[PDB]
């Protein structure tokens, strides 16, 4: 039995005002292409994150 | 025809509620106080004095708050009233100690849960020093 | 308390040697040299003198009845 | 100049000789009682609350000073005759001294006229006096005077005589006070415990403990999971757990930033900051200080009916009940908060893992309570009750309007009987109080052997209750090195709970921290009240007896100055210990009593401070006005406690630190005088314990006490229930250097024997031994036995009373069939009469409402001759007598004999000299032991001791039994033996007694020391 | 990850989000004062917590006599041969085994790991 | 064996040692060092058994199997062996050091209780205390073992 704790390295709660901001610089390259498809983006999205 | 190990005894004692050795001392003290000063009456019987020393020597608790806390703590469980005073009076050190001394507890108490009860009594009982 | 009369092992007399043993110690003689003078060739008898304590000296300090 | 390694062996033992000559073996018993009787007793009287009586007439009674006189005996005449300690044992009365207190009363009757009267030396009561103490009758007396008083000069004392019974206060280890400890328990609902029991100076109020716990992350909830782990603190008088943050608000720090300032010293570090955030959420709604006080008082033990009362109760609890040691007044809010923040800060380090959890078994965290500290707590029990008796007695008098005489008010019985009760029965504290007394304290002194008596006085006891239960007192910890003997421990269920103090180690008597506190102020030290919280980030914390004195800018300079004062016997006493936690920037100074510490040579720049000149003066220690105390004065040697030992480097011997091919450590601070001092009294007497197995060394500690021998010199004058004295107790052939300090050489408990290890006739198994009948006939192991019979004729009833007379068959109706010719006209058997079987030795009858015989017969059927008869008057004044029946026991097949190490072996068979296996020179071994014991339940030391004994006897020199002396070696001993025409390994050709043919195997025979154990067949069968 | 205090009452500034300007600003509750946050980060949590111990090691451990000293590894910015070394004191890193070196110079206080 | 233990310590000190997949680094290091010390006792002890001659009395007891054991002879002649406490080596009672004499964070043979001296030769002052710690555990276990087994 393995939990997310044993497979996770670090976690943080970042703030992003708009969906396209992605204040984190490193992940901006890959999140953009994935987020192009409006999956769950039919309405407003909260500016919080649980990366 | 009666045996404490098998929880068999006269039906009259079922209605009675058990008392702790330290708690009885408080009741004896209340009886002692009124007799000594409230009323001019013959001195208390030798039997009363003998049990007063027995309760005082084996008193495991300081004040009513400690006595009440243990009584309330053990009341939440399904502990039988006979075991209520017996467990508190004996103060078994470990779970294995209580079951051998109290055969009844082995019937409906596990080796782990009861250990969490005896240790709680230890945190409540205090020594003179 | 006091030095035994004779060796417990063989039976050689050792009580009489105690008086000379102490006298030889204060005469600048070695602990082992004194035993040879008394004539204790066996190690069983030398034990009775080399490693003996005379407790009666301290008991005699107390006054009698 | 310097001590050369070739001379260090003799030099190292010289300094140890001075230590015992000045300090002694019972200095820790005497010192604590001296402190208790000099200052603690005065402090209890001085710190007593004022006595106020009211019902217009106001009476204020105060105790001014306490006067203590030397022990005296009060008979029916009442004259203050001196009471010798020996008289107490013979008369079966407590050895004690009167207690006198000055009482001053001020009375005002509303007439605007204040007048007072002086009561000089009021007979408050009496205090038992430890033997050989400052107030004892045998202090500073020469050896000549002690004999005149029928007291053994070699007896160290340090015990109390109660009702004729010698009692030793067993030291009870307790968790150290005013110290923060963080432990982890997996059974509690919370992850971590911020346990810290805080108490004031020696004793002002009962100890109060607060647990600043931290809730575990295991629990899950809507809001609990978000904030996660929050800190909750339980106050001593608050049943529920209140958040710690609220406590600071109650103190006065309304601002939230101030809360973080006192807890988090380093704001730059964000790891600790995140942990405190959840704790603020619970306390956030409580912004105002009054609300915080209201919040705490809500769950108080006795909440007030009105709202304002809740604030007052909380104010008193935090001010007085909580953290008494840091501050007891009403203007210590800043000081109290800083200590409270430190407890949280200590918790944060442990929770994050950056600080190691405190060790439960660490002796630095445990304090030892001696007769002084123990009796100090007891004295308050009677004194507090004494005020109540005066108050209650005066209460009925005051309301009636007439003045009450003090002579009746003060109760002598409570003070006298109160201390005497527990010291006799052993149940600590008052019996009337509804509690469980701590048994096992003040046990009967073991006088079977002198070594046993010394071990009992230095005996230690592991903590009982939750503290002992949670920890592993039985297991041997590393801190015991040089402080508590590792080998010595009773065998059985209570194994490891009872221990013995190390020979060199002693327990701190105690001192006032005021001189240390004043010292810091004149230096760069700055108190918390003056500085801002930001200055604590970089500075080092200073603690005095667990109190927050204040940070210091530079730790190195202050400690070096502090160390110099300690070495110079300046205002800082050598007893005081300073601990520097470098990894935590904490400097802890402890001055309270109960700290176990041992001396250590100081090393500076890889060079011993102890020079040749110091040893030269020590060599002439007598008639030169030089003692051990001078060494500490010069700074060559100081004392290190358990906490300081954590940060003090040690070296076994100078050879280790002088130079090495590869430097194991180039910075040595202290050097041990000699490693063998770790052994206790019973373990010290063992040669080559390193060569011996650990259980065997532990087993000997029990056997050594059970060994019979001359226990003291004044055995004839005293009367003991059980006393075994050996006919010929001779010093061993193989003796340890530490044996001299124990005085076991003067009073040994065994007789050496030429032991041949062989299987003769198969009459000896693993647990057995074969003796020599002829040797026993010459006095090989014979010993005497003393049993004292006591009886008193008291007038318990007016109609019926006891008397001493001959129970004649006619005048007496009820009697038991026995011979009565032994008794004299006075009903007491005169000395010199042989008594055997069932015989009456003292005549006593009761005049029941014709008299019934109630005399005392012999306990057993043994044949003995009465030694001496004593007739006295007991404390009650009734006639009381004691008689000592002396019997002679001859070693037989049933007696149990034990070597100095191994398992006791019963005498399987006794053989005459002819039957024993004689050697070429005609030396029949006195004792033959089974060779099959050597492998497992014995030690090679037996063979080595035999080899050393043979060389010692042959060369006529007592061998050295130092456990860690490189000079003594098995090969070296073998070479010495070969020079005297003996086998290098000690083997000899033994001719069998029965058949004269040579035995094929060459037996190993040597003079091994042996001791006779108290276990004898005669006692068992005669019962 | 850090904590900031307001200038009015010096109290905690919990993270709050506004719906008009769509900007995260640290706002106190009891007092109306509110300040914007430029970090745009509320907090972080390292599950494995592999934090470097060099910052935790204190430079004043050089004078400790009990700590072992080795001259094999000299200080980087001093050149002094003597260097005190020891293992991690953190219980979290107790699983791992590593050595941390500190310069023995009186005032350098340099900490490095090989 | 002592040199091999130092080599293992050096490998762990330089992070060269690799933990086994079924164990962690700290526990793996304790396992490797234990085997080196354990193997030395058995190898030296076995040589002691061959050393004894037929005439030797120590060999006679073990050969017949009457009393004693080959391990007892090993502790008397070759080496006492490691003194394990609670199933592990001597713990760091002090701050990262078993005893004050040893340097901090010392995991060597002598520091952690490895007794390299036989009973005949004599144990060092450090080894004596470590031997006492090991013996104390056995006495405690023996005291409770009889009480539990009898029940
Ligand atoms: Zn002889
Ligand atoms: Zn604010
Ligand atoms: Zn540097």
Identify the CA nearest to D441 among candidates D465, D417, D422.
D422
CA dist D472 and D324 (Å) reads 30
Q: What is the DSSP string of D650-661?
A: --SSHHHHH--S
- Contact across the interface for E87 and F105, Cβ inside 8 Å: yes
Bridge partners, residue E5, by sequence: E12
CA dist D269 and D273 (Å) reads 7
Identify the CA nearest to D653 among candidates D610, D616, D618.
D610
- D540 to chain C, any CB pair closer than 8 A? The answer is no
Identify the CA nearest to D921 among candidates D848, D835, D981, D841.
D981
**Residue of E2, E19, E24 best to disrupt the A interface, most CBs of A under 10 A:** E24
D278 Cβ partners below 8 Å, 6+ apart?
D227, D228, D229, D230
Please tell me the distance between residue E4's alpha carbon and the centre of ligand 2 in angstroms.
10
Is E41 among the annotated ligand-binding positions? no
F64 Cβ partners below 8 Å, 6+ apart?
none
D111 Cβ partners below 8 Å, 6+ apart?
none
Question: Helix B115-124 and helix B81-90: axis angle, to 10°?
Answer: 60
Kindly state the tokens that stand for C6: 């004779």
Whichever domain contains D280, its CATH number is: 3.90.1110.10
**F73 phi, psi to nearest 5 deg:** -65, -35
- E48 to chain D, any CB pair closer than 8 A? The answer is no
CA dist D213 and D234 (Å) reads 8
Q: Which ligand is nearest to the CA of E14?
A: 2
- Contact across the interface for E97 and F15, Cβ inside 8 Å: yes
Residues D812-821: b if buried by 16+ CB within 10 A, e if exposed = beebeeeebe
DSSP E41: E
Kindly state the tokens that stand for D568: 């110079």
CA dist D271 and D274 (Å) reads 6
Kindly state the tokens that stand for D342: 């430190």
C-alpha distances out from residue D139 to D30, D40, D156, D373, F60, Å: 11, 20, 11, 21, 61
H or E segment to which residue C44 belongs: helix C43-50
Interface of D with E in 606-665 (CB under 8 A): 647-649, 665
Bridge partners, residue D911, by sequence: D772
A46 Cβ partners below 8 Å, 6+ apart?
none
Among the partner-chain residues E64, E91, E94, the one whose CB lies closest to the CB of D582 is: E64
**D416 phi, psi to nearest 5 deg:** -70, -60
Bridge partners, residue D990, by sequence: D919
- Contact across the interface for E43 and D257, Cβ inside 8 Å: no
Q: Which ligand is nearest to the CA of D772?
A: 1
The answer to whether D805 and D843 are in contact (CB under 8 A) is yes
**D788 phi, psi to nearest 5 deg:** -95, 130
- Contact across the interface for B126 and D435, Cβ inside 8 Å: yes
The answer to whether D769 and D760 are in contact (CB under 8 A) is no
- Contact across the interface for E24 and A47, Cβ inside 8 Å: yes
Identify the CA nearest to D805 among candidates D828, D784, D836.
D828
Q: Does an interface of 3+ CB pairs under 8 Å exist between E and F? A: yes
CA dist D651 and D649 (Å) reads 7
The answer to whether E45 and D275 are in contact (CB under 8 A) is no
C-alpha distances out from residue D334 to D293, D537, D628, D979, Å: 16, 17, 45, 80
**Residue of D206, D375, D434, D494 best to disrupt the B interface, most CBs of B under 10 A:** D434
- D470 to chain E, any CB pair closer than 8 A? The answer is no
Environment class of F150 (CB within 10 Å of its CB; exposed 0-12, middle 13-18, buried 19+): exposed
Rounded-to-5 percentages of helix, strand, coil across chain F: 55, 5, 40
Helix (H, G, I), strand (E, B), or coil: what is residue D950?
helix
Kindly state the tokens that stand for D1022: 């005669």
Q: How many structural domains compose chain B?
A: 1
Bridge partners, residue A15, by sequence: A48
The answer to whether D964 and F125 are in contact (CB under 8 A) is yes
Q: Determined by which method?
A: cryo-EM
CA dist D497 and D464 (Å) reads 9
C-alpha distances out from residue D616 to D1, D10, D612, D626, Å: 11, 12, 6, 11
**Residue of F70, F77, F94 best to disrupt the D interface, most CBs of D under 10 A:** F94
Is E6 among the annotated ligand-binding positions? yes
Kindly state the tokens that stand for A31: 């999140």
- Chain position carrying tokens 């002084």: D372
The answer to whether F103 and E67 are in contact (CB under 8 A) is yes
- Contact across the interface for A15 and E46, Cβ inside 8 Å: no
- Contact across the interface for D727 and C1, Cβ inside 8 Å: yes
| Catalytic option among D47, D359, D361, D767 | D767
Residues of E in contact with A25 (CB under 8 A): none
Neighbours of ion ligand 2 (CB under 5 A): E 6, 8-9, 11, 28, 31
CA dist D479 and D471 (Å) reads 14
DSSP F126: H
Bridge partners, residue D154, by sequence: none
User: Residue B26's domain spans which residues?
Assistant: 1-129
Strand pairing class (D1003-1012; D896-899): antiparallel
CA dist D498 and D460 (Å) reads 6
In D, minimum Cα distance to C12 occurs at: D778
Resolution in units of Å: 3.5
Among the partner-chain residues A10, A13, A15, the one whose CB lies closest to the CB of E47 is: A10
CA D825 to chain centre: 49
Tell me how many degrees the CA angle D416-D381-B25 measures, rounded to the nearest 5. 105
Please tell me the distance between residue E109's alpha carbon and the centre of ligand 3 in angstroms.
6
CA dist D611 and C3 (Å) reads 43
Among the partner-chain residues D652, D766, D939, the one whose CB lies closest to the CB of F101 is: D652
In C, minimum Cα distance to D912 occurs at: C9
Straight-line distance from the first to the last Cα atom of chain D, in angstroms, rounded to the nearest whole number = 67
Helix (H, G, I), strand (E, B), or coil: what is residue E14?
strand
Classify the phi-psi angles of D601: left when phi > 0, otherwise alpha if psi is within -120 to 50, otherwise beta: beta
Please tell me the distance between residue D764's alpha carbon and the centre of ligand 1 in angstroms.
25
CA atoms within 13 A on the CB side of E100: 24
User: Residue D332's domain spans which residues?
Assistant: 183-366
CA atoms within 13 A on the CB side of E55: 8
The answer to whether D594 and D364 are in contact (CB under 8 A) is no
Q: What is the DSSP string of E73-97?
A: S--TTT--S-EEEEE---SGGGGS-
- Contact across the interface for D926 and C42, Cβ inside 8 Å: no
- Contact across the interface for D695 and F135, Cβ inside 8 Å: yes
Helix (H, G, I), strand (E, B), or coil: what is residue F39?
helix
Residues of F in contact with D474 (CB under 8 A): 136, 140
CA dist D310 and B64 (Å) reads 21
Environment class of D524 (CB within 10 Å of its CB; exposed 0-12, middle 13-18, buried 19+): exposed
CA C40 to chain centre: 11
The answer to whether B122 and B91 are in contact (CB under 8 A) is yes
- Chain position carrying tokens 């020594």: B127
Report chain D's C-alpha Rg in angstroms.
34
CA dist E96 and D393 (Å) reads 71
The answer to whether D753 and D975 are in contact (CB under 8 A) is no
- D774 to chain C, any CB pair closer than 8 A? The answer is yes
Please tell me the distance between residue D901's alpha carbon and the centre of ligand 1 in angstroms.
25
The answer to whether D957 and D976 are in contact (CB under 8 A) is no
Could you tell me which chains touch chain E, where touching means 3 or more CB pairs under 8 A? A, D, F
D265 Cβ partners below 8 Å, 6+ apart?
D345, D533, D536, D537
Is E9 among the annotated ligand-binding positions? yes
Kindly state the tokens that stand for C36: 């040879």
Query: What is the biggest distance separating any 2 CA atoms in chain B, rounded to whole angstroms?
Result: 54
CB contacts < 8 A, B to D, total: 54
Among the partner-chain residues D301, D427, D469, the one whose CB lies closest to the CB of B65 is: D301
Strand pairing class (D769-772; D905-911): parallel
C-alpha distances out from residue E47 to A4, A12, B118, E50, Å: 10, 10, 37, 8
Identify the CA nearest to D882 among candidates D796, D801, D795, D804.
D804
D256 is annotated as an active-site residue: no
CB atoms within 10 A of CB D432: 13
Environment class of D964 (CB within 10 Å of its CB; exposed 0-12, middle 13-18, buried 19+): buried
Strand pairing class (D459-461; D171-175): parallel
Query: What is the total residue count of chain A?
Result: 51
CA dist D392 and D383 (Å) reads 14
CA C39 to chain centre: 12
DSSP D936: S
DSSP B79: -
CA atoms within 13 A on the CB side of D293: 22
CA dist D886 and B124 (Å) reads 53
C-alpha distances out from residue B60 to B17, B121, D418, Å: 19, 9, 21
The answer to whether D362 and D479 are in contact (CB under 8 A) is yes
Bridge partners, residue D62, by sequence: D104
Identify the CA nearest to D975 among candidates D986, D961, D964.
D986
Question: Helix D27-35 and helix D371-400: axis angle, to 10°?
Answer: 20
- Contact across the interface for E46 and A10, Cβ inside 8 Å: yes
């Amino acid at each position: 039995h393995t939990t997310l704790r044993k497979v996770t390295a670090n976690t943080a709660i970042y703030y992003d005002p708009n969906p396209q901001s992605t204040v984190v610089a490193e992940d901006q390259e890959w999140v953009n292409v994935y987020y192009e498809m409006p999956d769950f983006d039919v309405a407003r999205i909260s500016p919080w994150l649980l990366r | 025809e009666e045996d404490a190990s098998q929880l068999i005894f006269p039906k009259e004692f079922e209605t009675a509620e058990t008392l702790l050795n330290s708690e009885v001392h408080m009741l004896l003290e209340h009886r002692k106080q009124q007799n000594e000063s409230a009323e001019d009456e013959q001195e208390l019987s030798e039997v009363f004095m003998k049990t007063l020393n027995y309760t005082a020597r084996f008193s495991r608790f300081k004040n009513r708050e400690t006595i009440a806390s243990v009584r309330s703590l053990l009341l939440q469980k399904k502990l039988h009233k006979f075991e209520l005073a017996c467990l508190a009076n004996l103060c078994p050190e470990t779970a294995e100690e209580s079951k051998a001394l109290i055969p009844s507890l082995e019937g409906r108490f596990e080796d782990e849960e009861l250990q969490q009860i005896l240790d709680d009594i230890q945190t409540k009982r205090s020594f003179q020093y | 308390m006091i030095i035994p009369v004779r060796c417990f092992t063989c039976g050689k007399i050792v009580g009489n040697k105690w008086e000379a043993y102490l006298g030889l110690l204060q005469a600048e003689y070695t602990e082992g040299d004194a035993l040879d003078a008394l004539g204790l060739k066996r190690y069983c008898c030398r034990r009775m003198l080399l490693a003996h304590v005379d407790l009666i000296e301290k008991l005699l300090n107390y006054a009698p009845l | 100049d310097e001590i050369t390694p070739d001379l260090w062996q003799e030099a190292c033992w010289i300094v140890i000789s001075s230590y015992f000559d000045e300090k002694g073996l019972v200095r820790q018993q005497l010192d604590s009682f001296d402190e208790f009787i000099q200052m603690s007793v005065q402090r209890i009287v001085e710190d007593a609350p004022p006595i106020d009586l009211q019902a217009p007439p106001r009476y204020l009674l105060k105790f001014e000073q306490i006067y203590l006189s030397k022990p005296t005996h009060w008979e029916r005449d009442g004259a203050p005759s001196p009471m010798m300690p020996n008289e107490a044992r013979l008369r079966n009365l407590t050895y004690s001294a009167p207690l006198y207190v000055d009482i001053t009363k001020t009375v005002i009757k509303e007439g605007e006229e204040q007048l007072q009267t002086q009561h000089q030396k009021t007979f408050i009561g009496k205090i038992p006096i430890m033997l050989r103490s400052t107030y004892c009758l045998l202090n500073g007396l020469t050896d000549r005077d002690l004999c005149e008083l029928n007291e053994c000069p070699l007896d160290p004392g340090g015990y109390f005589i109660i009702n004729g019974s010698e009692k030793v206060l067993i030291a009870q280890e307790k968790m150290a006070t005013n110290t923060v400890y963080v432990f982890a328990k997996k059974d509690s609902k919370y992850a971590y415990t911020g346990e810290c029991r805080s108490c004031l100076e020696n004793s002002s109020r009962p100890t109060s403990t607060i647990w600043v716990s931290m809730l575990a992350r295991g629990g899950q909830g809507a809001k609990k999971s978000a904030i996660g782990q929050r800190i909750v603190a339980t106050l001593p008088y608050i049943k529920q757990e209140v958040p710690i943050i609220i406590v600071f608000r109650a103190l006065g720090f309304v601002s939230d930033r101030d809360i973080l300032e006192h807890i988090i010293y380093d704001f730059e570090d964000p790891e600790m900051m995140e942990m405190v955030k959840p704790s603020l959420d619970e306390a956030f709604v409580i912004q105002e200080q009054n609300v915080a006080l209201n919040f705490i008082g809500s769950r108080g033990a006795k909440p007030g009916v009105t709202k304002e009362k809740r604030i007052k109760y909380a104010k008193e609890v935090l001010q007085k009940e909580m953290l008494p040691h840091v501050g007891v007044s009403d203007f210590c809010e800043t000081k109290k908060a800083y200590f409270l923040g430190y407890m949280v800060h200590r918790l944060l380090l442990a929770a994050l893992g950056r600080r190691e959890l405190d060790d439960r078994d660490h002796y630095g965290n445990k304090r030892l309570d001696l007769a002084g500290p123990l009796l100090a707590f007891l004295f308050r029990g009677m004194f507090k009750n004494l005020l109540k008796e005066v108050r209650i007695y005066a209460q009925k008098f005051i309301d009636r309007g007439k003045d009450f005489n003090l002579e009746l008010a003060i109760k002598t019985r409570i003070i006298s009987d109160g201390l005497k009760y527990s010291l006799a029965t052993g149940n600590w504290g008052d019996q009337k109080k509804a509690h469980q007394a701590r048994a096992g304290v003040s046990q009967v002194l073991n006088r079977l052997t002198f070594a046993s008596t010394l071990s009992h006085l230095r005996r230690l006891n592991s903590p009982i209750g939750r503290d002992g239960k949670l920890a592993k007192p039985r297991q041997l910890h590393n801190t015991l090195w040089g402080m508590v003997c590792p080998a010595e421990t009773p065998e059985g269920h209570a194994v490891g709970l009872v221990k013995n103090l190390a020979l060199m180690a002693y327990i701190s008597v105690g001192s006032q921290p005021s001189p240390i506190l004043e010292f810091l102020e004149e230096w760069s030290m700055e108190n918390l009240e003056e500085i801002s919280p930001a200055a604590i980030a970089d500075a080092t914390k200073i603690f005095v007896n667990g109190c927050w004195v204040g940070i210091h800018k530079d730790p190195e300079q202050l400690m070096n100055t502090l160390r110099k004062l300690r070495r110079q016997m300046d205002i800082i006493v050598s007893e005081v210990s300073m601990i520097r936690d470098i990894r935590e920037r904490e400097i802890r100074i402890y001055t309270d009593a109960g700290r176990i510490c041992r001396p250590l040579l100081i090393v500076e720049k890889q060079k011993l401070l102890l020079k040749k000149r110091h040893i030269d003066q020590l060599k002439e220690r007598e008639y030169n006005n030089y003692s051990w105390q001078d060494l500490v004065a010069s700074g060559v040697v100081e004392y290190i406690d358990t906490l300081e030992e954590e940060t003090v480097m040690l070296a076994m011997t100078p050879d280790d630190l002088q130079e090495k091919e590869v430097a194991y450590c180039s910075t040595y601070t202290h050097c041990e005088i000699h490693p063998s001092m770790i052994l206790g009294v019973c373990a010290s007497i063992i040669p080559f314990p390193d060569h011996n197995q650990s259980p065997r060394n532990t087993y000997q500690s029990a056997m050594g006490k059970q060994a019979m021998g001359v226990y003291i010199t004044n055995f004839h004058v005293r009367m003991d229930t059980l006393a075994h004295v050996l006919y010929y107790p001779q010093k061993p052939l193989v003796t340890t250097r530490s044996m001299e300090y124990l005085r076991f050489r003067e009073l040994p408990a065994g007789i050496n024997s030429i032991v041949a290890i062989a299987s003769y006739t198969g009459y000896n198994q693993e647990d057995s031994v074969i003796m020599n009948r002829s040797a026993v006939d010459r006095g090989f192991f014979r010993s005497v036995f003393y049993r004292s019979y006591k009886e008193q004729e008291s007038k318990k009833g007016f109609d019926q009373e006891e008397v001493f007379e001959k129970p004649t068959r006619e005048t007496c109706q009820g009697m038991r069939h026995a011979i009565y010719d032994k008794l004299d006209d006075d009903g007491l058997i005169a000395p010199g009469v042989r008594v055997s079987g069932d015989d009456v030795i003292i005549g006593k009858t009761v005049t029941l409402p014709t008299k019934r015989d109630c005399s005392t017969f012999l306990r057993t059927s043994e044949t003995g001759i009465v030694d001496q008869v004593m007739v006295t008057l007991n404390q009650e004044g009734y006639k009381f007598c004691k008689i000592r029946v002396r019997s002679v026991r001859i070693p037989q097949i049933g007696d149990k004999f034990a070597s100095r190490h191994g398992q006791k072996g019963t005498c399987g068979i006794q053989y005459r000299q002819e039957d024993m296996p004689f050697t070429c020179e005609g030396i029949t071994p006195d004792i033959i032991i089974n060779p099959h014991a050597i492998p497992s339940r014995m030690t090679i030391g037996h063979l080595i001791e035999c080899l050393q004994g043979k060389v010692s006897a042959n060369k006529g020199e007592i061998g050295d039994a130092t456990p860690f002396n490189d000079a003594v070696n098995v090969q070296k001993i073998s070479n010495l033996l070969s020079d005297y025409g003996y086998h290098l390994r000690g083997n000899e050709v033994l001719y069998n007694g029965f058949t004269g043919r040579k035995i094929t195997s060459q037996i190993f025979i040597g003079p091994t020391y042996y001791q006779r154990l108290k276990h004898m067949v005669d006692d068992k069968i005669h019962s | 990850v850090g904590i900031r205090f307001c200038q009015e009452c010096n109290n905690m500034l919990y993270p709050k989000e506004d719906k008009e300007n769509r900007i995260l600003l640290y706002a106190c509750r009891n007092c109306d004062y509110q300040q914007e946050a430029d970090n745009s980060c509320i907090y972080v949590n390292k599950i494995t917590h592999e934090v470097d111990e060099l910052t935790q090691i204190i430079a004043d451990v050089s004078q400790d006599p009990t700590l072992p000293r080795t001259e094999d590894h000299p200080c980087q910015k001093c050149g002094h041969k003597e260097a005190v070394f020891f293992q991690s004191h953190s219980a979290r890193a107790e699983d791992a085994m590593r050595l941390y070196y500190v310069c023995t110079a009186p005032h350098c206080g340099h900490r490095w790991t090989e | 064996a002592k040199q091999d233990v130092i080599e293992v310590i050096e490998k762990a000190h330089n992070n060269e040692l690799e933990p086994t997949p079924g164990n962690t680094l700290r526990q793996t290091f304790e396992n490797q060092v234990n085997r080196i010390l354990n193997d030395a006792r058995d190898k030296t002890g076995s040589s002691a058994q061959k050393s004894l001659s037929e005439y030797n009395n120590f060999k006679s007891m073990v050969v017949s199997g009457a009393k004693g054991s080959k391990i007892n002879i090993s502790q008397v002649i070759a080496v006492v062996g490691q003194q394990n406490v609670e199933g592990k080596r001597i713990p760091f009672g002090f701050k990262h050091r078993t005893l004050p004499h040893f340097i901090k964070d010392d995991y060597g043979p002598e520091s952690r209780g490895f007794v390299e001296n036989s009973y005949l030769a004599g144990l060092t002052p450090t080894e004596f205390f470590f031997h006492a710690m090991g013996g104390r555990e056995g006495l405690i276990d023996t005291a409770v073992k009889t009480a539990e087994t009898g029940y």
